[PDB]
Design a protein around this ligand. Structure first.
Ligand SMILES: *[C@@H]1O[C@@H](C)[C@@H](O)[C@@H](O[C@@H]2O[C@H](CO)[C@@H](O)[C@H](O)[C@H]2O)[C@@H]1O
Ligand SMILES: [Cl-]
Ligand SMILES: [Mg+2]
Length: 254
């Protein structure tokens, strides 16, 4: 005993975790002339809203710093997110070590705590020169994320980019032209790289829900002649029928 229904699946919800390398290897001139415009062009291409893309943003250096939480004003309003980038241009100087594993671990923590939206595509954008505090540890956590169906895109930034590491953590194959998971040019190429990951595509599918067993049919409304009775059941799903009335006859009336 189940119920079938039609619905549209568009995958419009995306939790996008932007992890930004703010470590000392990035280089200040690179930060100003390349990273900031990268962030502006990238975030400007993201049509954030309550119902679709929600941005999370972390800056990782010696420590990790959570800049934007999923669901807040700055998470769902592109203009507010761009203000954060401006704040970083004016007040942040890249310095220190590179807590890439800890930053990826913040994504893990979202999944573990069930803070993400269950129906949302989980998308990590890792923006880095690819020189983490520990290569093995960063690969390990990235691989754990992938095994939980999290998509990972890598954007190369910084004065001295380790493309080999970036390509490895992104999952790029050797002898393969134009990896779909790694980009290291300008914001235009980054935007184009991200697009297929977040595209809304609507299909119409059928769905099945289990409504469970019915309660016993009640006694007939009349003890003689033609009457009615009913059976009920708790709603285990929105589109499950909960009540049901049929006719009955307890003989004839004298
Ligand atoms: C249940 O027991 C039966 C043997 C009858 O005595 C039923 O009574 C009758 O109820 C019907 C309507 O259901 C009336 O139209 C009759 O006038 C009445 O005798 C009793 O409810
Ligand atoms: Cl690390
Ligand atoms: Mg570094």
């Amino acid at each position: 005993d189940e119920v079938k229904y039609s619905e549209e699946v568009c995958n419009e919800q995306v939790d996008l975790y932007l992890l930004v390398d703010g470590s000392g290897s990035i280089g200040y001139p690179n930060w100003i002339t390349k990273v900031i415009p990268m962030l502006n062009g990238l975030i400007n291409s993201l049509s954030l809203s309550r119902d679709t893309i929600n941005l999370y943003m972390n800056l990782f250096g010696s420590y990790t710093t959570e800049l934007i939480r999923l669901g807040s004003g700055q998470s769902i309003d592109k203009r507010q997110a761009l203000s954060k980038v401006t704040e970083l241009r004016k007040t942040y100087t890249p310095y220190g070590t590179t807590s890439m594993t800890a930053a990826l671990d913040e994504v893990q923590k979202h999944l573990n705590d069930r803070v993400n939206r269950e129906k949302a595509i989980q998308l990590v954008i890792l923006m880095t020169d690819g020189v983490p505090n520990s290569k093995y540890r960063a690969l390990e956590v990235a691989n754990k994320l992938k095994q939980r169906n999290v998509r990972l895109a890598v954007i190369g930034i910084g004065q001295g980019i380790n493309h080999q590491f970036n390509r490895l953590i992104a999952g790029c194959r050797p002898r393969e032209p134009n990896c779909k998971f790694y980009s290291y040019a300008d914001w235009n190429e980054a935007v184009a790289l991200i697009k297929p990951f977040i595209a809304k595509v609507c299909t119409e599918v059928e769905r099945v829900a289990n409504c469970g067993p019915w309660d016993p049919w009640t006694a007939c409304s009349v003890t003689c002649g033609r009457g009615t009775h009913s059976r009920s059941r708790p709603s285990l799903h929105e589109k499950c029928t909960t009540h049901m009335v049929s006719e009955c006859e307890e003989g004839e009336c004298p």
